């Protein structure tokens, strides 16, 4: 098979001239040794198909037309180059970016002209078969004759090419009659999984049923995708199994089930580099930025500057403080929105969701267990930890759940005694909720209480209760009209990048500039508002501090300030008045 050698010597040349990949292999060889010096990376080198055409078209057309004869000599060549690297103290994997395609196909259009040829499928992935080990290298120890003894197991998906099947069990006294004990943990196991892929629901032609084909995901690729995710798989299209023709009478016509091996799995729908962080740093000094930011949330939504301000102040959230040998005070801020429909309350929340960096959305009922583990024989709020939970139609939700939400929100933990596993597990999530007024449109005129409909402590738990009115005016109307019109005919993405660095860097602590302000304010609130309106408690005070610290994060300031205190004052005022 000197031609397989030719493929290797040919793919050799491609690397190191040009050398643009070799630096990445070196990077892989170095990073792991750096982990060796410490006190994880899959070994595979993504090959852009882009570059392959510049050198040889003959070898380019081959990878697409007949990948079985080509990918493995190229692979053996990649290992061969990884061993000439540095130094001592594995098969790897190819990837194939592309430069698609031909071979571009959705799963609906495929079979057989596209079989035994590289393929990039795309569609929804369900139901994602459960992750499981797969044996490859057999390793044994002989005694007292010693040495070291190994067998090599060839499965159906071994390499690419078909080979005389090795399986199964263990060699167990290979000649001469010496005993062989299985050596576990020297022997190699590559993980293995399969996931079926349905064509995109929106490009479905008719009431004709969906056609899905299965993709086996080797090695690292495993557990890279939850089911229901947009996926563009790549891989060689393989037909495995006899069609029944192997066994002699299997009489049925049905046969040759097909699947795709490998390979990449690019998902479809943070890194701050050098320049971005500089942009932030420059932008932090400007005094008015908060208002611009607060406007950046709402391309499609009028006014509500105060509410947008709020959502930012939730995205940041008052650090977290865990006292020595004592309970921790709640860091994050929770928000509610109440008003007549068309208030965008349900529209706002999706935009909360997108840029939120997590978390799970929940709408009314909803449930079961909401955040709970349910103690499965034989949830959200937990899985949403360090994130933004959305709740829609927050009123509709059964009181049974609310009882638990009390425990989630302030206390900050979830407790499960159910049968069972008995544990206190932590859900520290931030929370938004939008909830319709009691009955009809009556919210606006109706009393400060009896309007909310969901007493009582809940009303308190939420740091901010914002009320919005749909009441109509002609002027405001016109001003609605134009923007609505233009809509149908500084960057927003920069907003989350702006946010993460702000979140882990750096926590502003607290300063004696401010305290007297929030104390004055607080005492004012209790004393005067308890005549004006309700509810007010120490909780409000806590919230004051969280808001202060959050606006400090917006300012990037290593310290809390008086101005910030005044801001918190302002928004909590518009909350109240």
């Amino acid at each position: 098979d000197a031609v397989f050698g030719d493929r290797v010597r040919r793919f050799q040349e491609f690397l190191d001239t040009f050398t643009s990949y070799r630096d990445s292999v070196r990077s892989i060889q170095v990073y792991n040794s750096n982990n060796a010096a410490n006190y994880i990376l899959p070994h595979r080198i993504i090959i852009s198909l882009d570059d392959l055409r510049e050198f040889d078209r003959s070898f380019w057309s081959g990878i697409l037309v007949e990948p079985a004869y080509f990918i493995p000599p190229a692979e053996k060549a990649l290992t061969d180059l990884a061993d000439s690297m540095d130094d001592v103290p594995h098969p790897w994997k190819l990837s194939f970016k592309g430069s698609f395609g031909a071979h571009a196909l959705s799963p609906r259009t495929l079979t057989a002209q596209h079989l035994n040829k590289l393929v990039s499928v795309e569609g929804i992935v369900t139901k994602t078969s459960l992750v499981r080990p797969k044996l490859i290298r057999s390793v044994h120890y002989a005694a007292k004759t010693g040495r070291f003894h190994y067998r090599d197991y060839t499965d159906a998906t071994t390499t690419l090419t078909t080979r005389i099947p090795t399986p199964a069990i263990y060699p167990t006294e290979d000649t001469e009659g010496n005993k062989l004990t299985t050596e576990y943990g020297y022997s190699t196991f590559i993980d293995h999984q399969r996931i079926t892929v349905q064509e995109m629901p929106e490009m479905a032609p008719a009431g004709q049923l969906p056609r899905s084909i299965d993709v086996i995901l080797d090695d690292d690729l495993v557990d890279k995708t939850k089911p229901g995710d947009r996926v563009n798989v790549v891989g060689v299209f393989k037909s495995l199994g006899a069609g029944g023709m192997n066994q002699s009478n299997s009489n049925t016509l049905i046969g040759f089930k097909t699947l795709i091996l490998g390979n990449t799995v690019y998902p479809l729908h943070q890194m701050l580099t050098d320049f971005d962080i500089r942009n932030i740093n420059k932008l932090s000094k400007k005094k008015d930025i908060f208002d611009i930011l607060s406007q950046s949330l709402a391309p499609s939504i009028y006014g509500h500057d105060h509410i947008k301000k709020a959502i930012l102040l939730m995205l940041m959230g008052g650090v977290e403080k865990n006292l020595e040998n004592g309970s921790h005070l709640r860091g994050d801020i929770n928000i509610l929105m109440v008003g007549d429909p068309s208030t965008a309350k349900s529209q706002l929340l999706r935009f909360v969701l997108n840029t939120a960096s997590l978390a799970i959305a929940t709408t009314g009922r909803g449930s079961s267990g909401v955040g709970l583990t349910a103690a499965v024989t034989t949830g959200a709020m937990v899985l949403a930890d360090r994130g933004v939970v959305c709740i829609d139609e927050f009123d509709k939700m059964t009181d049974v759940d609310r009882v638990a939400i009390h425990e989630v929100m302030e206390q900050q933990t979830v407790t499960i005694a159910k049968a069972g596993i008995h544990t206190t597990l932590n859900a520290r999530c931030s929370v938004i909720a939008a909830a319709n007024p009691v009955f009809g449109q009556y919210d606006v005129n109706r009393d400060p209480h009896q309007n909310i409909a969901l007493p009582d402590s809940l009303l308190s738990r939420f740091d901010l209760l914002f009320v919005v009115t749909d009441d109509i005016n002609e002027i405001r109307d016109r001003s609605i009209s134009e923007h609505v019109l233009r809509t149908h005919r500084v960057t927003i993405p920069f907003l989350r990048k702006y946010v993460q660095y702000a979140k882990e860097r750096v926590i502003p602590q607290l300063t004696q500039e401010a305290i007297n302000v929030i104390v004055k304010n607080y005492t004012d609130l209790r004393n005067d508002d308890n005549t004006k309106k309700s509810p007010i408690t120490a909780r409000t005070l806590e919230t004051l501090i969280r808001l202060a610290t959050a606006h400090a994060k917006v300012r990037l300031s290593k310290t809390v300030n008086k101005v910030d205190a005044k801001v918190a004052a302002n928004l909590l005022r518009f909350a109240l008045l």
Partner: protein, 139 residues
């Protein structure tokens, strides 16, 4: 871990176990534990026979075997049958793991998700809630 320090620096230098154990960790149960047979105190004290149930069985086995063999001459019961004890390794978390051997620790209280096919045949700590807890039966 403590022993290697005395056997290294502080020589004379020797091959490592703590990495080599958890690297395999099955093989040592049949190897590290059989050594106990060679150094164990023979009498040891006041052992008798019965006393214990089923020890008398094997005692009479080796008595009749010794007698009948010593009569015949006028290849032995396996070392795993005679034990009556179990060898259990424990993880090094550890307060003294800070020696430091660094990467030596698993003993990494890992996620069930973190579990890989590359951890087979290597001691691993895991954590989670007990499920279904099947009732004991003799092996």
């Amino acid at each position: 871990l403590q022993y290697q320090n005395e056997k290294f620096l502080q020589g004379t230098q020797a091959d490592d176990l703590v990495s080599a154990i958890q690297q395999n960790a099955n093989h040592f149960t049949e190897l590290f534990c059989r050594a106990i047979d060679n150094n164990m105190p023979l009498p040891t004290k006041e052992i008798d026979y019965k006393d214990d149930v089923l020890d008398v069985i094997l005692n009479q086995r080796r008595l009749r075997n010794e007698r009948m063999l010593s009569d015949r001459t006028n290849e032995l019961f396996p070392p795993n049958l005679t034990r009556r004890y179990f060898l259990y390794f424990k993880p090094l978390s550890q307060n003294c793991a800070r020696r430091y051997r660094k990467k030596a620790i698993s003993s990494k209280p890992l996620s069930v998700r973190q579990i890989k096919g590359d951890f087979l045949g290597q001691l691993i700590t895991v954590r989670g809630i007990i499920t279904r807890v099947s009732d004991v039966k003799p092996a």
